[PDB]
Design a protein around this motif. Structure first.
Motif, PDB file in Angstrom:
ATOM      1  N   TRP A 193      -6.538  70.381  14.062  1.00  0.00           N
ATOM      2  CA  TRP A 193      -5.305  70.760  13.354  1.00  0.00           C
ATOM      3  C   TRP A 193      -5.512  71.954  12.407  1.00  0.00           C
ATOM      4  CZ3 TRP A 193      -0.633  71.424  11.487  1.00  0.00           C
ATOM      5  CH2 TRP A 193      -0.325  71.271  10.114  1.00  0.00           C
TER       6      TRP A 193
ATOM      7  N   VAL B 209      -3.503  56.645  15.235  1.00  0.00           N
ATOM      8  CA  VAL B 209      -2.712  57.884  15.257  1.00  0.00           C
ATOM      9  C   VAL B 209      -2.558  58.478  16.659  1.00  0.00           C
ATOM     10  CG1 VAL B 209      -2.460  60.160  14.268  1.00  0.00           C
ATOM     11  CG2 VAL B 209      -3.634  58.354  12.966  1.00  0.00           C
TER      12      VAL B 209
ATOM     13  N   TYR C 249       5.035  63.001  11.412  1.00  0.00           N
ATOM     14  CA  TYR C 249       4.773  64.342  10.886  1.00  0.00           C
ATOM     15  C   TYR C 249       5.063  65.320  12.026  1.00  0.00           C
ATOM     16  CZ  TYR C 249       2.442  68.684   9.623  1.00  0.00           C
ATOM     17  OH  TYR C 249       2.223  70.018   9.363  1.00  0.00           O
TER      18      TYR C 249
ATOM     19  N   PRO D 119      -0.012  70.257   5.129  1.00  0.00           N
ATOM     20  CA  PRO D 119      -0.453  69.073   4.380  1.00  0.00           C
ATOM     21  C   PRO D 119      -1.983  69.124   4.416  1.00  0.00           C
ATOM     22  CG  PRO D 119       0.057  68.465   6.620  1.00  0.00           C
ATOM     23  CD  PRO D 119       0.553  69.887   6.441  1.00  0.00           C
TER      24      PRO D 119
ATOM     25  N   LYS E 146      -4.120  55.993   8.028  1.00  0.00           N
ATOM     26  CA  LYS E 146      -3.142  55.325   8.883  1.00  0.00           C
ATOM     27  C   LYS E 146      -3.710  54.785  10.201  1.00  0.00           C
ATOM     28  CE  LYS E 146      -0.072  55.062   5.971  1.00  0.00           C
ATOM     29  NZ  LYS E 146      -0.427  55.023   4.525  1.00  0.00           N
TER      30      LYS E 146
ATOM     31  N   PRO F 123      -7.952  60.792  19.749  1.00  0.00           N
ATOM     32  CA  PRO F 123      -8.266  60.666  18.322  1.00  0.00           C
ATOM     33  C   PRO F 123      -8.982  61.830  17.609  1.00  0.00           C
ATOM     34  CG  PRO F 123      -9.516  59.127  19.712  1.00  0.00           C
ATOM     35  CD  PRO F 123      -8.287  59.541  20.448  1.00  0.00           C
TER      36      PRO F 123
ATOM     37  N   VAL G  91       4.929  56.051  10.107  1.00  0.00           N
ATOM     38  CA  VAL G  91       4.915  57.450   9.684  1.00  0.00           C
ATOM     39  C   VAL G  91       4.820  58.585  10.698  1.00  0.00           C
ATOM     40  CG1 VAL G  91       3.638  59.117   8.334  1.00  0.00           C
ATOM     41  CG2 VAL G  91       4.121  56.842   7.386  1.00  0.00           C
TER      42      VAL G  91
ATOM     43  N   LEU H 208     -10.092  66.587  12.639  1.00  0.00           N
ATOM     44  CA  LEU H 208      -9.602  65.275  12.215  1.00  0.00           C
ATOM     45  C   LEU H 208     -10.035  64.073  13.060  1.00  0.00           C
ATOM     46  CD1 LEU H 208      -6.120  66.643  11.262  1.00  0.00           C
ATOM     47  CD2 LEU H 208      -7.618  65.369   9.655  1.00  0.00           C
ATOM     48  N   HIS H 209     -10.542  63.061  12.362  1.00  0.00           N
ATOM     49  CA  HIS H 209     -10.987  61.825  12.980  1.00  0.00           C
ATOM     50  C   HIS H 209     -10.158  60.729  12.288  1.00  0.00           C
ATOM     51  CE1 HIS H 209     -14.979  64.263  13.144  1.00  0.00           C
ATOM     52  NE2 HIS H 209     -14.319  64.440  14.273  1.00  0.00           N
ATOM     53  N   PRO H 210      -9.769  59.663  13.024  1.00  0.00           N
ATOM     54  CA  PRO H 210      -8.970  58.580  12.429  1.00  0.00           C
ATOM     55  C   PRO H 210      -9.431  57.909  11.131  1.00  0.00           C
ATOM     56  CG  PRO H 210      -9.892  57.913  14.525  1.00  0.00           C
ATOM     57  CD  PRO H 210      -9.971  59.417  14.462  1.00  0.00           C
TER      58      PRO H 210
ATOM     59  N   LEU I 154      -4.464  62.996   2.841  1.00  0.00           N
ATOM     60  CA  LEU I 154      -3.968  62.174   3.929  1.00  0.00           C
ATOM     61  C   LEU I 154      -4.451  60.721   3.759  1.00  0.00           C
ATOM     62  CD1 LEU I 154      -3.805  64.289   7.188  1.00  0.00           C
ATOM     63  CD2 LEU I 154      -2.102  63.542   5.558  1.00  0.00           C
ATOM     64  N   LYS I 155      -3.670  59.771   4.276  1.00  0.00           N
ATOM     65  CA  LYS I 155      -4.027  58.365   4.161  1.00  0.00           C
ATOM     66  C   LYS I 155      -4.607  57.810   5.446  1.00  0.00           C
ATOM     67  CE  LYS I 155      -1.074  57.348   0.221  1.00  0.00           C
ATOM     68  NZ  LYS I 155      -0.061  56.455  -0.429  1.00  0.00           N
TER      69      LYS I 155
ATOM     70  N   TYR J  10     -10.675  60.052   3.071  1.00  0.00           N
ATOM     71  CA  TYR J  10      -9.209  60.090   2.926  1.00  0.00           C
ATOM     72  C   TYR J  10      -8.730  59.510   1.587  1.00  0.00           C
ATOM     73  CZ  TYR J  10      -8.344  61.617   7.641  1.00  0.00           C
ATOM     74  OH  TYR J  10      -8.283  62.415   8.769  1.00  0.00           O
TER      75      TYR J  10
ATOM     76  N   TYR K 282       2.527  64.259  15.029  1.00  0.00           N
ATOM     77  CA  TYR K 282       1.453  63.401  14.581  1.00  0.00           C
ATOM     78  C   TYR K 282       1.893  62.031  14.103  1.00  0.00           C
ATOM     79  CZ  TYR K 282      -1.892  67.297  14.834  1.00  0.00           C
ATOM     80  OH  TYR K 282      -2.727  68.325  15.218  1.00  0.00           O
ATOM     81  N   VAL K 283       2.194  61.138  15.039  1.00  0.00           N
ATOM     82  CA  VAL K 283       2.629  59.777  14.704  1.00  0.00           C
ATOM     83  C   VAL K 283       1.443  58.840  14.513  1.00  0.00           C
ATOM     84  CG1 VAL K 283       4.081  57.845  15.351  1.00  0.00           C
ATOM     85  CG2 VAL K 283       4.432  60.119  16.414  1.00  0.00           C
ATOM     86  N   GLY K 284       1.456  58.045  13.449  1.00  0.00           N
ATOM     87  CA  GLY K 284       0.344  57.146  13.228  1.00  0.00           C
ATOM     88  C   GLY K 284       0.709  55.994  12.320  1.00  0.00           C
TER      89      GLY K 284
HETATM   90  C1  LIG Z   1      -6.874  62.561  13.347  1.00  0.00           C
HETATM   91  O1  LIG Z   1      -5.456  62.655  12.828  1.00  0.00           O
HETATM   92  C2  LIG Z   1      -5.126  62.297  11.361  1.00  0.00           C
HETATM   93  C3  LIG Z   1      -6.031  61.429  10.456  1.00  0.00           C
HETATM   94  C4  LIG Z   1      -5.540  61.027   9.089  1.00  0.00           C
HETATM   95  C5  LIG Z   1      -4.168  61.332   8.730  1.00  0.00           C
HETATM   96  C6  LIG Z   1      -3.397  62.348   9.587  1.00  0.00           C
HETATM   97  C7  LIG Z   1      -3.907  62.791  10.846  1.00  0.00           C
HETATM   98  N1  LIG Z   1      -2.165  62.940   9.090  1.00  0.00           N
HETATM   99  C8  LIG Z   1      -1.481  64.248   9.616  1.00  0.00           C
HETATM  100  O2  LIG Z   1      -0.363  64.656   9.062  1.00  0.00           O
HETATM  101  O3  LIG Z   1      -2.121  64.962  10.683  1.00  0.00           O
HETATM  102  C9  LIG Z   1      -2.327  66.515  10.496  1.00  0.00           C
HETATM  103  C10 LIG Z   1      -1.388  67.379  11.381  1.00  0.00           C
HETATM  104  C11 LIG Z   1      -2.142  66.820   8.968  1.00  0.00           C
HETATM  105  C12 LIG Z   1      -1.264  61.956   8.253  1.00  0.00           C
HETATM  106  C13 LIG Z   1      -0.043  61.391   9.127  1.00  0.00           C
HETATM  107  S1  LIG Z   1      -0.465  61.498  10.962  1.00  0.00           S
HETATM  108  C14 LIG Z   1       0.839  60.329  11.555  1.00  0.00           C
HETATM  109  C15 LIG Z   1      -2.090  60.773   7.414  1.00  0.00           C
HETATM  110  S2  LIG Z   1      -1.143  59.833   6.174  1.00  0.00           S
HETATM  111  N2  LIG Z   1      -3.523  60.689   7.590  1.00  0.00           N
END
Ligand SMILES: COc1ccc2c(c1)N(C(=O)OC(C)C)[C@@H](CSC)C(=S)N2
Lengths: 556, 430
Positions: A229, A106, A181, A95, A103, A225, A179, A234-236, A100-101, A318, A188-190
């Motif tokens: 990946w 996370v 993943y 993905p 969320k 946080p 959600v 990745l940052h929230p 990404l949204k 995002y 990756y729950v968030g």
């Molecule tokens: C800092 O982490 C994140 C910040 C923004 C997002 C994610 C991770 N996302 C994700 O799939 O993580 C990786 C493995 C692709 C998804 C769902 S994560 C429950 C979404 S909708 N936005």
């Protein structure tokens, strides 16, 4: 810790049978490193020591990778991997972060050794047999049988990513919007819950799992946080790639320029403005990864011109399903285009570059519309919609390369921008032959094996000429003959061509090329008033070939 | 809650495996439309979810048939046919009534829903698995397998063939002269009756098709400038051809003649052996283009010979059933297109000029798809096989936009053009 989940039916391709070996007899200590692990792996029910009546086998590497404190093994299923059936690929991609949204909160849960928990079908277990003989050869036949999914094994990641999609299912149903993943060994729950309320859903999950068999010691959501990946940082609430440090040397091989052309490429996702043209331009020598290539000065001019935009960091937004999607494209020259995609002005979601290669003479208008597609494709693959285009091209020069082009094209919603490097037609040929203007019958010839050409022309009012060429291909020469013919004309001209090749190359009305030959015809076309290009077949006396190819005649 | 019948054992082609094609990424509204469809259908026992032990595949699209309201599912079964149906083009083939091409008025009814009743083989079903896509590769695929007969598959009407003959029987004898052809989910019907008379003859078949089972021909309606009122009435009587519009007013000047020497020189390897010399020597000199020059005495014997040889071909029309048609289209302008159905290069089996208004949508990728569909229903009526297309379009643009204006059941095999032809001069049968 075996799971009580509906197991999956595995088979070996018809005609085949499971593998059978016998491994390199080990000694005292190494076997002591296997008996300890295996006879407590059976206690946890992952394997089972079935002796006689099973004819197969597999080897055991007692690999203490790195230098661990606790001894570890690894059974190489190389031969089984061939024999087993084909599974559906879980790795249907990645993905990509731009889609990404936001969320709010996370977390990532380590489902690392969650493979040894899911069970393997009760029939296939025998094809996963492995044996370990003693030093003294006193009690041979020490052979287990795998109960769960073993490491490596083709179907493992397949069966897991499917078993655990059924496991999360009731949770996901009961409580949606929270959600989930999953990839290999990550969860990756968030959601949009205030931390403590989010810290509950996680422990709820961590216990549903512990109830389904697969233990997850991610001590109270034990994962921070900032995430790494698949390279992505990745940052929230925003994204980018963190480590991207591309060094320099003084004499590097191809082995290292390919890694170079790699990083600059990857970085193209976020960092507004980047080109890996000249760095790869010379990679033509697909030789060995040991031969050094003295990088050109135009490659450093680019490697350095990258290092600036690359030095000072860039951020990544995002997606917001309600907010528009609008992309724009800038001409970065050398047949290289760059695009940026936005919802809320300026702040970037995703950036990237398009650049036509291996097949020249292409039009800019055409190169524009090719890039648009690349994007229209990348949009649907990610966001699920199509960007409203913001394009540096006048409608009256576009519908003149829709209604004028052979191949059929199509670009969705697009709007006019304003930027100094406008994309448009520099010239355009005539349709009806011109009146009064001098008629130039052009001709060109060369040697198939003596490689020494002759250019030239003849005009409607006895005005001849011939410019001998050397190291010029017949193709080039036919081209050179028109340029010659171009130079000796006033403001408006007519030119009858020998070649179909040269004809069909000047018809598409290109602009850029490395061939000064074609670039020089272009320049004549751009300053000329009215140009008309006729065509007559070679080898058939059409036009004036009788006396026209009797003058440019070679000695062979 | 069910009614279990009997199964015709379906097996694979000479040592082959199942298609493992890949699902092209889909729009959102469309992925929503597909689950809207596939779930009710899942309740209907028609399709069903699978696990990892099934690695096969097949593309799934979404199309809004006729007019906008509800989506239709489409399955690019192009590979499975290629797999299974070239042995079922023999073992269980559906014969082509070669008089369909002569019958004054052909009509097509969507008798594709009739298969969703017939159960499919317990051992074969895996090869019909299809996968529903997700936006941004988040979630793993919604992976289904077919329980019954797939409506896309070329090996479906072959099975139902038995049943289709029995159900149409009463009609074929109450109405004898009517030629009926069953290709895929389509029922091509043709008579010698005029509009008013044939249009009801079809309603007749519709109602007959209704009563005698749950086979149902989906309601037909729409209103484009061209009369699309009743049915998709093709008229195989108008199958005449002369695209080559040789300029009557062009042999006046030098340039006109230079053009006239060019078109003709193609008709050389097309029409073996042509005389153009006495005309060419008329511009053998390096003269001025716009020179209004009269023709020579022995020139007319070159123009009018070929000009009358442009009125009667000879060998060409020879259809080898052990080879396949190739359709090649080339853009000509704002509305008009031109196609060529050959089978072995330069030998024209059938040519025509697709068209449409200049005051219309004038959209390139609308006309191309609506032309591809035409070239093909024509080749059903005529050859009983869908041609391989040689498309004048960007591979990647077509892959995006075809599934939009594709109001059609089947999907022919395709190819795209890399080079610029001289064939789109005024019109040209390659
Ligand atoms: C800092 O982490 C994140 C910040 C923004 C997002 C994610 C991770 N996302 C994700 O799939 O993580 C990786 C493995 C692709 C998804 C769902 S994560 C429950 C979404 S909708 N936005």
């Amino acid at each position: 810790p075996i799971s009580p989940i509906e197991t999956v039916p595995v088979k070996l391709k018809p005609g085949m049978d499971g593998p059978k070996v016998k491994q390199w007899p080990l000694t005292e200590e190494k076997i002591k490193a296997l008996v300890e692990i295996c006879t407590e792996m059976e206690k946890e029910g992952k394997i089972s020591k079935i002796g006689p009546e099973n004819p197969y086998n597999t080897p055991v590497f007692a690999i203490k990778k790195k230098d661990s404190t606790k001894w570890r093994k690894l059974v190489d299923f190389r031969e089984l991997n061939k024999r087993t059936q084909d599974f559906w690929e879980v790795q249907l991609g990645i993905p990509h972060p731009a889609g990404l949204k936001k969320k709010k909160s996370v977390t990532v849960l380590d489902v690392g050794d969650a493979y040894f928990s899911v069970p393997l079908d009760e029939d296939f277990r025998k094809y996963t047999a492995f044996t370990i003989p003693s030093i003294n050869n006193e009690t041979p036949g020490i052979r287990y049988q795998y109960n769960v999914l073993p490491q490596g094994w083709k179907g493992s990641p397949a069966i897991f990513q499917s078993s655990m999609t059924k496991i999360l299912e009731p949770f996901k149903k009961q409580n949606p919007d929270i959600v989930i993943y999953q990839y290999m060994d990550d969860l990756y729950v968030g959601s949009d819950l205030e931390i403590g309320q989010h810290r509950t859903k996680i422990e709820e999950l961590r216990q549903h799992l512990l109830r389904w068999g697969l233990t997850t010691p991610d001590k109270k959501h034990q994962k921070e946080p900032p995430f790494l990946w698949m390279g992505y940082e990745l940052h929230p609430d925003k994204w980018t790639v963190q480590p991207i440090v591309l060094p320099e040397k003084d004499s590097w091989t191809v082995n290292d320029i390919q890694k170079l052309v790699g990083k600059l490429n990857w970085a193209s996702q976020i960092y507004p403005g980047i080109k890996v043209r000249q760095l790869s331009k010379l990679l033509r020598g697909t030789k060995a990864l040991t031969e050094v290539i003295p990088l050109t000065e135009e490659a450093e001019l680019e490697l350095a011109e990258n290092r600036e935009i690359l030095k000072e960091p860039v951020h990544g937004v995002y997606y917001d399903p309600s907010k528009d999607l609008i992309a724009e494209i800038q001409k970065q020259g050398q047949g290289q285009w760059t695009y940026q995609i936005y919802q809320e002005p300026f702040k970037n979601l995703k950036t990237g570059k398009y650049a036509r290669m291996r097949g020249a003479h292409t039009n800019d208008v055409k190169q524009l519309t090719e890039a648009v597609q690349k994007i229209t494709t990348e949009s649907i693959v990610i966001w699920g919609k199509t960007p409203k285009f913001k394009l540096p091209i006048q409608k009256e020069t576009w519908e003149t390369w829709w209604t004028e082009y052979w191949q059929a094209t199509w670009i969705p919603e697009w709007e006019f921008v304003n930027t100094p490097p406008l994309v448009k037609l520099w010239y355009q040929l005539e349709k009806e032959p011109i009146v009064g203007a001098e008629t130039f019958y052009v001709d060109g010839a060369a040697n198939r094996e003596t490689k020494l050409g002759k250019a030239g022309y003849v005009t409607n009012k006895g005005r001849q000429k011939v410019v001998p060429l050397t190291n010029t291909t017949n193709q080039k020469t036919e081209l050179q003959a028109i340029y010659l013919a171009l130079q000796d004309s006033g403001l408006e001209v007519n030119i009858v061509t020998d070649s179909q090749y040269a004809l069909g190359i000047i018809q598409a009305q290109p602009d850029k090329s490395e061939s000064e030959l074609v670039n020089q015809i272009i320049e004549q076309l751009i300053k000329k008033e009215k140009v008309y290009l006729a065509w007559v077949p070679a080898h058939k006396g059409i036009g004036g070939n009788e006396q026209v190819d009797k003058l440019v005649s070679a000695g062979i | 809650p069910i009614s279990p019948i009997e199964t015709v054992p379906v097996k694979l082609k000479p040592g082959m495996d199942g298609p493992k094609v890949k699902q092209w990424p889909l729009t959102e509204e469309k992925i929503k439309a597909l689950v809207e469809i596939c779930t009710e259908m899942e309740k209907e026992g028609k399709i069903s979810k699978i696990g990892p032990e099934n690695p096969y595949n097949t593309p799934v699209f979404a199309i809004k048939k006729k007019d906008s309201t509800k989506w239709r599912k489409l399955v690019d079964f192009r590979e499975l046919n290629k797999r299974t149906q070239d042995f079922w083009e023999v073992q269980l083939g559906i014969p082509h009534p070669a008089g369909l091409k002569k019958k004054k008025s052909v009509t097509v009814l969507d008798v594709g829903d009739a298969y969703f009743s017939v159960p499919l083989d317990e051992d074969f079903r895996k090869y019909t698995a299809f996968t529903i896509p997700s936006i941004n590769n988040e979630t793993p695929g919604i992976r289904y397998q077919y329980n019954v007969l797939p409506q896309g598959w070329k090996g479906s009407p072959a099975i139902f063939q038995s049943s289709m003959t029995k159900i149409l029987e009463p009609f074929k004898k109450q109405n004898p002269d009517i030629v009926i052809y069953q290709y895929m989910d389509d029922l091509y019907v043709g008579s010698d009756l005029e509009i008013g008379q044939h249009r009801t003859k079809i309603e007749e078949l519709r109602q007959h098709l209704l009563r005698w089972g749950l086979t149902t021909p989906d309601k037909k309606h729409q209103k484009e400038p061209p009369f699309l009122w009743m049915g998709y009435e093709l008229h195989p009587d108008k199958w005449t051809v002369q695209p080559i519009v040789l300029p009557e007013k062009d042999s006046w000047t030098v340039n006109d003649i230079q053009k006239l020497v060019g078109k003709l020189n193609w008709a050389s390897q097309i029409y073996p052996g042509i005389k153009v010399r006495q005309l060419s020597k008329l511009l053998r000199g390096t003269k001025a283009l716009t020179e209004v020059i009269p023709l020579t005495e022995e020139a007319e014997l070159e123009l009018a010979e070929n000009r009358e040889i442009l009125k009667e071909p000879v060998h060409g029309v020879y259809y080898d059933p052990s080879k396949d048609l190739i359709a090649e289209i080339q853009k000509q302008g704002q509305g008009q297109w031109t196609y060529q159905i050959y089978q072995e290069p330069f030998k024209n089996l059938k040519t025509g000029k697709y068209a449409r208004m200049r005051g219309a949508h004038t959209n390139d990728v609308k006309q191309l798809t609506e032309a591809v569909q035409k070239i093909t229903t024509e080749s059903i009526v005529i050859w009983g096989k869908t041609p391989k297309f040689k498309l004048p379009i960007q591979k990647e643009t077509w892959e995006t936009w075809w599934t939009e204006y594709w109001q059609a059941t089947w999907i022919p095999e395709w190819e795209f053009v890399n080079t610029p032809p001289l064939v789109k001069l005024w019109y040209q049968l390659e």
